[PDB]
Scaffold this active site. Structure first.
Site, short mmCIF file in Angstrom:
data_model
loop_
_atom_site.label_atom_id
_atom_site.label_comp_id
_atom_site.label_asym_id
_atom_site.label_seq_id
_atom_site.Cartn_x
_atom_site.Cartn_y
_atom_site.Cartn_z
N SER A 1 4.46 -4.74 -0.22
CA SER A 1 2.89 -5.25 0.31
C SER A 1 2.39 -3.68 -0.86
O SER A 1 2.04 -3.15 -0.76
CB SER A 1 3.12 -4.02 1.98
OG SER A 1 3.66 -4.43 3.05
N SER A 2 3.14 -3.53 -2.13
CA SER A 2 2.54 -2.58 -2.81
C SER A 2 3.28 -3.01 -4.31
O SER A 2 3.80 -3.68 -4.98
CB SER A 2 2.83 -1.28 -3.28
OG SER A 2 2.26 -0.56 -1.89
N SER B 1 2.94 1.97 3.49
CA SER B 1 3.43 0.99 3.57
C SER B 1 4.98 1.44 2.69
O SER B 1 6.41 0.66 3.42
CB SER B 1 3.72 -0.20 4.87
OG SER B 1 2.64 -1.16 2.88
N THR C 1 1.23 -1.32 0.26
CA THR C 1 0.17 -0.02 -0.23
C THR C 1 0.70 1.44 -0.10
O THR C 1 1.75 1.77 1.16
CB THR C 1 -0.88 0.18 1.27
OG1 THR C 1 -1.73 -0.93 1.04
CG2 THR C 1 -1.86 1.18 1.04
N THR C 2 0.41 2.05 -1.18
CA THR C 2 1.34 3.18 -1.44
C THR C 2 0.30 4.60 -1.64
O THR C 2 0.35 4.47 -2.97
CB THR C 2 2.42 3.24 -2.51
OG1 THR C 2 3.07 2.28 -1.65
CG2 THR C 2 3.51 4.73 -2.16
#
Ligand SMILES: CC(C)(C)NC(=O)C[C@H](NC(=O)CCc1ccccc1)C(=O)NCCNC(=O)c1cccc(-c2ccccc2)c1
EC number: 3.4.25.1
Lengths: 204, 201, 199, 213, 196, 219, 216, 199, 196
Positions: free
Chosen positions: C168-169, C129, C1-2
């Protein structure tokens, strides 16, 4: 395991117009056999028995509250409860305690009031109603009963062969368990009569 | 499991039930629980099984080495004491071994109790195992050192019988030996529940 | 997640990756992290995706009642005060982070940061993150007074960098440019992410 | 916390007749929620008379069988004769117990022919503790196969039934029908059946198909 | 520690208990009474964690007396046992988990005598005889060896002294004197305390 | 428990296994999972079976009542919204990982709502323990605008891969084809397993069971 | 090595008529971070063996130095006896197992494939001592995503031509790129056959995102 | 802690911050994280400063015995194999990380990474707690074939970025350029760190 | 549980112990002996965790007998007490922590009688009288009330029966019969076991 604190296993099984419900009779604290006539199969109608298992207090408490809601239903209605209605009722009742669950794993066995179609169902301790067609089990020694029933059950057995099958199922299934046994009770549910039978089980 | 033993005018009879239960499950229910070491020794077993089998069998190995070296048929004192040393070496290592060494030595019928910790006890009446206490109760009320072998045997069957009746971890058949002067002789390997129906009617 | 936002003259630009992963296997490889709170106020979600969604919806509700009751488009400062209140009042129960951005007649483009329940206007307010891997790039490549295309290619570059390094991305990069004209929703497919030093 | 034991499932089975000893196991090698291989037979031919089963933690099954066979050639070298089933039983008790404090987590069931050509099956537990039975199941599905083998083989809880000796064929149909009864219900049983028959003639191997789902 | 016991013959119930209320090494009291007279024909025997016994069982006593003063008659022992079972079960999961083990021995004019057991988890079970405490582990097999459904109350007391003599011989705790009451159609009969 | 979804040109199609375990043991063999929500909006159930049952049944009632209220078709946005507020209020204790699908006036919409409340529209998905294999094959063969037949065989490949490749998911696959016209519950689409027969009859003549006590009650 | 510092992702293994082919992306992670992006996780042991490894990477290099040291010590003799893939597999099974027995486990999940005497061996060895052959292997989450694809296709065709295997590995790795969080579009494909071990890479995976415009 | 190395044609460049902090208050605001292992082989320490120091000293000892015994300067691959062995053999007891870099007649400049006991030659091998904030910058600004001044100003920029964001890194930036001529030790005072976007 | 006791008058030491070796509820043995005759004039009284008592104290017994067979004379009781103190202290931190509480009552021809205490942490302390177990908490104040340094051994036994009667009245554990030995210049005198 809180479930095996008293031990005991009950199964039903479906035939040709008759479903037979069994149960063991050993009320015991963990290792101390305390009683050999503890009741687990509570009638809920002329042809409808609800066999419970597990911790003793949830056995008797679920049985008594269920009989409460069932007498209110039959009175307020004009009719005995159909087995599917009873199943949804008990599932509702266990599920109202979703986070404080009654440690009871009931199985309901009976006949349609009008058409007299056989019926069974087992539930988990939070109320996942699982109608079946061949049989159900419940209690500390479920596995042995899955073996003996799954090997002994056959499609369309009349009452007498049914009593033979469920007889040997309970006997063999409980003798290989420590925390159950001490006799066995069996109920045949025909269209017209209801036979109660206890069995000769190992007293050790 | 419930295992008892007592001695009287005519020797020592040791009775053991015959169920072995892995937790809540009955693994086998006609187990032989009484390892026979010599022609006239006798050691029962209880608790975790593998400890009793290994250490008591090994005890038989020590006794056989003794009997070959000194040729004088190792006594009950050396037996229970030596097993007491095998247990005392591994103190607090988790060994669950509660057993009894019955026999007949020069001093007479020597009955010993050898615990997992190193407890070692001569005595008249013993009862080990998960359902020992019941066997205590039904033995004492009905024990007297002037019992003949018959009343002794029936007393054992009553003891192990009710001991496996009230207990969850005990049942099957009852083994019961009779450690006489010239060595043991297996008196019976009796079914239990049939006994309880012979005792309920 | 970014997720990332930028402030430029006519409005903002809210880039955001398009992966939501469950542990080590991904659950959704396309997920729009930009849910509208009004016609011209987007919130970039992050953290507990369920929690972020509930906050975006409640905030959209209050911002819509307050929106109609005044009969005038709710200022972004209002929106980040309601999302700030709902993120602060529940801070022990929500692992949410909502870089709420938008436009409004009275102030123009804004990008308020609301991690942990705080409120701080910022030029570029990156989160998520993967945002811990692009502080270097954004600090080295941010010059105030960016034209819109500079903002869009900029945040595309930055989230591209975060996507290459971060686990996470991943996926596609959504971009929306909020101005007085309206919202201009755009998508960056994995074949279009500007390639960087790959080794 | 590093966990050194994992339950790779797969059930074995062993029966003793008047002149033979079947050993059987499923070859699903499960773990967690997957199926590593639908083929990893859990019976290991030890000698010409002894067929050893292993269920449970698959690694200790491999190591334990390898150690056993090494001990068999040690014995054969120092004694000029293969171990009988009796010796293999006792030796596998001291192997399984010599690690009493970090167990081999492998439910063995050694079936085979003693020197009298008669059946013998030595079911074990992970820490030693053996015995000689006439029939036995072990592993994941032991609790669903054990009672039915009491029934059709031990004839317990029957009335007016002739305790006929266990014939090789009826033992076969018992093995296959009970493993089907487990495959329906046990999650860890299925994907194959490896039935090895032991007689004086050697070891004949027979396999069966089961539910794959 | 605390040892109840109850036997149920043809027309009575001969309950007995120990008379010690200890504090961790020392018997602070050797004349304590563990049998709480419910009504004319109902004894309640409560043992376990201190505070739960007196508070709970006096609560039950007061509800029963209240019933008799409301309706002019008493609860039949089945009704009382299932009542105390209700409170103990409803309080099993509640704010106040009462850790009491009971035996509500009773005799009804109609149904006859009955001896209800109850572990601390509200498990109710009618039985012809019961026990509690660790002394149960040394006596129940004795009752099994000597019990007979047609036992006479004199034979009952003889049996009971066999059990209690067994506790004085074998059980580890100093339990010197035991209360013993009988219940028949004539009510409660405070019989002579067994000593050693 | 391996449930999956899919979206094609005309409408959606939901898959489902038919097994339900009790911690090591296959309890059921024919448990249903494509539950009912609205006349064209179906909701598959994974995770805690009791909580998927109760949740989807409550929301079923609210959409029925609502459906009589507005005098209109229920929109799947409504179903997903009530489901995720109900799921969110409890803070994820109600582990009922629904996958709700339907066909509105807007078009076929296959939502997926996890136990904490995180919903996410998407064209194909698969929940449950066999979400690995189902996600695998759906990833590998999905295409926008598929034929309903290719959708049916494809989803059956998916839930099949869950069936064979997982432990706690077996029995038969159930796929329900929803379209703008209506719902068709294609119960028991494929049956991979065949083991239903046997070769050993285990019968005991009446009298082999030792009965102690007896009684009969006419009705 | 109780804890993993630099792990890899799933390895894929699949047999085919006359050789074995495995793939393992060249990524080396450190937590969620993709720190090392050009490390190779597939070793050539000799003309007939080639090895793979997920999990901890440092222990993989320990097994590279030790294992290559063994095969070099054995090539030194020049006696014509070389470890077939079954010997190397059994050896790693024993080393991994023993290290487990000391509770100092090598945190690898290796996948040894080889081809000696026209018989395609394909082993598996995880940290705890589990070992077996199989026509299709995939460590890590590959046992969840790519494993059902491989057992599906091999179920459809237990004997595969080499290129069909190679496409099957490429397509499995496409799935791993789309769905495995610790993956990366950069993987090696190793092919062991009659001729010997050939390590192609770094390769890449075409990716489709047409669904990304489907949500509306 | 943010140590960094780069490979260019004639040699390498090992930048490194100059702070070692104890929790939230610093212990040493000047600390050379580059201890020589030979005449032309530096190891950039990180992690447990004591452990990294012991590792650097033992490795220097073995590399010096092996150095003299061959009578030829020990190749960097040798050095990173001994530091790799000592970092792998003790990996449960040392929280060390040693980007060992240098020069040698047979291969020219090298920068081996040895985190956790592994060995991997790399173009630029950044490490340290602040290294998680400059992956973006280095990936966006690294172009192979860097002249020496490009490498020096480059790593100075990168460690500058890490110093501005990271709390575990601050102070001055040491730079050494290892080539065939010799080592060229340089220091970057806090007044000379190239300023970046500060807000 | 286990209760030692020892009193030291002008010319003797009158030690007494309980005769029960229990297992968690049941007296497995009521004729067990907790006093281990070291030598002609030295009794060793060991109580505590099972296995430690017999193994340890027989180790001490064998070392003392060995000393007498090596040198033709016996350890003076000070020497024996400080010896057992050495082994128990050196084993306090070792692989085998023996959890035994001792009283090594003794009488020397020269120095006179002395009654050495020892908690399980190897703390040695000569005392005119001691105790162990929970029964110490109910008897030591009694000995303080009745002890006098010139007490005669008959008065000693009278006192000791006051203490033990106190245990039978008040202490919670069933301790029925007690061993009692005296030690004077003539050696050990196995006196009559006190019962109740
Ligand atoms: C019937 C057969 C032949 C298979 N053995 C077991 O299942 C043995 C049975 N032993 C186990 O499950 C091993 C469980 C275990 C798992 C992991 C680490 C360590 C132990 C067992 O004994 N469980 C209760 C404890 N022991 C006893 O209750 C006991 C008491 C007295 C005698 C015996 C006994 C000894 C030898 C032969 C037969 C009985 C057992």
């Amino acid at each position: 395991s809180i479930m095996s604190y008293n031990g005991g296993a009950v199964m039903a099984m479906k035939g040709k117009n008759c479903v037979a419900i069994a149960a063991d009779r050993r009320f015991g604290i963990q290792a101390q056999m305390v009683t050999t006539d503890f009741q687990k199969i509570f009638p809920m109608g002329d042809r409808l028995y609800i066999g419970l298992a597990g911790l003793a207090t949830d056995v008797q408490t679920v049985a008594q509250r269920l009989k409460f809601r069932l007498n209110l239903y039959e009175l307020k209605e004009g009719r005995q409860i159909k087995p599917y209605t009873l199943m949804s009722m008990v599932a509702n009742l266990l599920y109202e305690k979703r986070f404080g669950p009654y440690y009871t794993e009931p199985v309901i066995a009976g006949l349609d009031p009008k058409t007299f179609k056989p019926f069974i169902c087992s539930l988990d301790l939070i109320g996942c109603p699982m109608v079946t067609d061949d049989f159900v089990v419940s209690g500390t020694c479920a596995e042995q009963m899955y073996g003996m029933c799954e090997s002994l059950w056959e499609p369309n057995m009349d009452p007498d062969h049914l009593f033979e099958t469920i007889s040997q199922a309970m006997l063999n299934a409980v003798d290989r368990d420590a925390v159950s046994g001490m006799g066995v009770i069996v109920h045949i549910i025909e269209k017209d009569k209801i036979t109660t039978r206890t069995l000769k089980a190992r007293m050790d | 499991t419930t295992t008892l033993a007592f001695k009287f005018q005519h020797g020592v009879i040791a009775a053991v039930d015959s169920r072995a239960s892995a937790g809540s499950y009955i693994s086998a229910l006609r187990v032989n629980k009484v390892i026979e070491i010599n022609p006239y020794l006798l050691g029962t077993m209880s608790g975790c099984a593998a400890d009793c089998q290994y250490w008591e069998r090994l005890l038989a190995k020590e006794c056989r080495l003794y009997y070959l070296r000194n040729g004088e048929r190792i006594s009950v004192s050396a037996a229970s004491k030596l097993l007491s040393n095998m247990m005392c070496q591994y103190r607090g290592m988790g060994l669950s071994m509660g057993s009894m060494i019955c026999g007949w030595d020069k001093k007479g019928p020597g009955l010993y109790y050898v615990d997992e910790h190193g407890t070692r006890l001569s005595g008249n009446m013993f009862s080990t195992g998960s359902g020992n206490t019941y066997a205590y109760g039904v033995m004492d009320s009905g024990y007297r050192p002037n019992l003949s072998p018959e009343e002794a045997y029936d007393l054992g069957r009553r003891a192990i019988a009710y001991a496996t009746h009230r207990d969850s971890y005990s049942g099957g058949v009852v083994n019961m030996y009779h450690m006489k002067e010239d060595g043991w002789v297996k008196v019976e390997s009796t079914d239990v529940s049939d006994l309880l129906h012979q005792y309920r009617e | 997640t970014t997720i990332m936002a930028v402030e430029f003259d006519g409005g903002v630009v809210m880039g955001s990756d398009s992966r939501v992963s469950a542990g080590e296997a991904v659950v959704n490889r396309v997920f729009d992290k930009l849910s509208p709170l009004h016609e011209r106020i987007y919130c970039a979600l992050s953290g507990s995706a369920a929690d972020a969604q509930a906050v975006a919806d409640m905030a959209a509700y209050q911002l819509e009642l307050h929106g109609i009751e005044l009969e005038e488009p709710p200022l972004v400062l209002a929106a980040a005060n309601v999302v700030r209140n709902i993120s602060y009042k529940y801070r022990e129960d929500l692992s949410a982070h909502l870089m709420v951005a938008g436009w409004d007649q009275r102030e123009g483009g804004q990008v308020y940061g609301t991690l942990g329940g705080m409120l701080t206007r910022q030029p570029f307010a990156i989160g998520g993150s993967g945002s811990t891997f692009i502080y270097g790039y954004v600090d080295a490549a941010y010059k105030p007074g960016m034209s819109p295309e500079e903002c869009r290619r900029f945040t595309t570059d930055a989230i591209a960098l975060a996507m290459s390094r971060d686990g996470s991305s991943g996926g596609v990069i959504y971009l929306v440019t909020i101005t007085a004209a309206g919202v201009d929703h755009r998508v960056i497919l994995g074949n279009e992410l500007p390639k960087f030093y790959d080794e | 916390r590093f966990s050194p034991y994992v339950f790779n499932g797969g059930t074995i089975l062993a029966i003793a007749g008047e002149d033979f000893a079947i050993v059987a196991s499923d070859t699903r090698l499960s773990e967690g929620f997957s199926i590593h291989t639908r083929d990893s037979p859990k019976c290991y031919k030890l000698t010409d008379k002894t067929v050893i089963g292993c269920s449970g933690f698959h690694g200790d099954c491999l190591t334990l069988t390898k150690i056993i066979e090494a001990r068999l050639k040690m014995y054969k070298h120092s004694n000029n004769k293969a171990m009988t089933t009796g010796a293999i039983a006792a030796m596998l008790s001291t192997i399984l117990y010599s690690r009493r404090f970090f167990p081999y987590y492998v439910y063995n069931i050694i079936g085979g022919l003693d020197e009298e050509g008669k059946g013998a099956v030595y079911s074990f537990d992970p820490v030693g503790s053996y015995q000689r039975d006439s029939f036995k199941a072990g592993g994941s599905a032991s609790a669903m196969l054990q009672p039915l083998l009491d029934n059709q083989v031990g004839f317990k809880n029957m009335q007016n039934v002739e305790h006929v000796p266990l014939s090789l064929d009826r033992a076969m149909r018992l093995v296959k029908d009970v493993f089907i009864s487990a495959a329906e219900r046990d999650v860890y049983t299925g994907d194959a059946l490896r039935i090895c028959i032991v007689t004086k003639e050697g070891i004949r191997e027979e396999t069966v198909s089961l539910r794959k789902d | 520690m605390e040892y109840l016991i109850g036997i149920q013959g043809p027309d009575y119930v001969l309950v007995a208990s120990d008379r010690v209320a200890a504090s961790n090494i020392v018997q602070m009291k050797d004349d304590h009474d563990k049998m709480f007279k419910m009504s004319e024909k109902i004894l309640l025997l409560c043992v376990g964690e201190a505070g739960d016994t007196v508070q709970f069982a006096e609560y039950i006593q007061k509800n029963v007396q209240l019933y008799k003063m409301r309706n002019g008659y008493e609860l039949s022992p089945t009704a009382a046992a299932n009542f105390t079972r209700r409170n103990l079960a409803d309080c099993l999961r509640s704010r106040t988990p009462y850790h009491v083990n009971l035996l509500l021995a009773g005799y009804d004019e109609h149904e006859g005598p009955a001896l209800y057991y109850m572990d601390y988890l509200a498990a109710l079970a009618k039985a012809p005889f019961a026990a509690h405490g660790y002394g149960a582990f040394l006596t129940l097999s004795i009752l099994d060896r000597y019990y007979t459904p047609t036992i006479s109350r004199e034979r009952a007391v003889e049996l009971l002294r066999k059990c209690l003599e067994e506790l004085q011989k074998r059980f580890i705790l100093n339990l010197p004197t035991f209360s013993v009451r009988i219940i028949d159609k004539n009510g409660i009969h405070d019989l002579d305390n067994i000593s050693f | 428990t391996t449930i999956a979804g899919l979206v094609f040109q005309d409408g959606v199609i939901l898959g489902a296994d038919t097994r339900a375990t009790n911690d090591s043991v296959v309890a059921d063999k024919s448990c249903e999972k494509i539950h009912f929500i609205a006349p064209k909006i179906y909701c598959c159930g994974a995770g805690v079976a009791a909580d998927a049952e109760m949740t989807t049944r409550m929301v079923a009632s609210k959409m029925e009542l609502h459906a009589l209220s507005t005098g209109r078709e229920p929109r799947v946005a409504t179903v997903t919204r009530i489901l995720r507020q109900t799921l969110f209020r409890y803070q994820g204790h109600v582990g009922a990982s629904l996958i709700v699908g339907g066909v509105d006036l807007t078009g076929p919409q296959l939502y997926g709502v996890h136990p904490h409340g995180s919903y996410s529209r998407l064209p194909f998905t698969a929940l449950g323990s066999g979400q690995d294999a189902a996600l695998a094959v759906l990833e590998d063969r999905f295409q926008p605008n598929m034929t309903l037949e290719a959708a049916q065989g494809l989803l059956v490949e998916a839930v099949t891969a869950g069936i064979l490749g997982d432990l706690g998911s077996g029995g038969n696959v159930d796929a329900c084809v929803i379209t703008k016209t209506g719902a068709k519950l294609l119960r028991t689409l494929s049956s991979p397993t065949e083991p239903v027969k046997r070769s050993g009859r285990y019968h005991f003549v009446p009298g082999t069971t030792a009965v102690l006590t007896q009684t009969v009650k006419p009705l | 090595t109780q804890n993993p510092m630099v792990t890899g992702t799933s390895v894929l293994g699949v047999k085919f008529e006359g050789g074995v082919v495995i793939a393992a992306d060249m990524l080396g992670s450190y937590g969620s971070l993709a720190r090392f992006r050009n490390i190779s996780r597939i070793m050539r042991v000799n003309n007939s063996t080639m090895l793979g490894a997920s999990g901890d990477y440092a222990d993989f290099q320990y097994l590279k130095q030790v294992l290559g040291q063994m095969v070099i010590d054995e090539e030194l003799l020049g006696d014509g006896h070389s470890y077939s893939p079954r010997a190397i597999h059994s050896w790693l099974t024993r080393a991994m197992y023993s290290r487990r027995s000391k509770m100092n486990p090598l945190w690898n999940t290796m996948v040894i494939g080889g081809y000696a005497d026209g018989e395609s061996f394909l082993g598996y060895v995880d940290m705890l001592g589990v070992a077996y052959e199989a026509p299709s292997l995939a460590t890590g989450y590959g046992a969840y995503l790519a494993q059902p694809l491989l057992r599906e296709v091999l179920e459809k065709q237990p004997v595969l031509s080499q290129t069909e295997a190679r496409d099957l590995v490429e397509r499995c790795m496409r799935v791993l790129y789309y769905r495995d969080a610790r993956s990366y579009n950069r993987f090696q494909i190793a092919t062991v056959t009659e001729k010997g071990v050939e390590i192609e890479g770094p390769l890449s995976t075409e990716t489709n995102w047409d669904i990304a415009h489907m949500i509306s």
